[PDB]
Structure 1
Amino acid sequence: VQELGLSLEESRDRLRFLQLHNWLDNRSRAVFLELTRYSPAVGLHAAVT
C-alpha cells in the first residue's frame, strides 16, 4: 500500500518518487486505486474503485 500523501504538493513528490524508484514496471499484478465521496445534500456515500 501507498497512501499518496495528504497535501497536493507532497502528493506530486510521492508520485514521482514512486515513478523513479522501480515500483510499477516489473511485477505489477494490479494497481487497485480506490476512493470514497460524501454528498451531504442528499446524504449519500459513494465508493469509487
Structure 2
Amino acid sequence: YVQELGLSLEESRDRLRFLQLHNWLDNRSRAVFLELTRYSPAVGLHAAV
C-alpha cells in the first residue's frame, strides 16, 4: 500500500494524523516496510535504510 507520506514542510504530520484517523492499515496489516534514503555529502557515500 504505497503511501507517499510527503508534504515535507509541515503537512507530513497532518497526513500521518489523517491516515491514523481514517484507519488506513488498522486491521489486517502484516508489516509496515518503511524505507527512504541517506546521503553523506562529506564521505561521498550514499546509504539505503
Give the TM bin, normalised by the shorter chain: 0.7 to 0.9
Larger strand proportion, structure 1 or 2?
A: 1
Give structure 1 regions of 4+ aligned residues with deviation exceeding 6 angstroms.
none
Q: 1:34 Cα shift?
A: 0.1
The percent of aligned pairs where both chains have the same amino acid is 100
Matched ranges for 1:1-49 at <5 A: 1-48=2-49
TM-score by length of 2: 0.84
* CA-based RMSD: 1.1
Gaps of 5+ in 2: none
Q: 1:33 Cα shift?
A: 0.3
Gaps of 5+ in 1: none
Q: Whose RCO is larger (CA < 8 A, sep 6+)?
A: 1
Larger helix proportion, structure 1 or 2?
A: 1
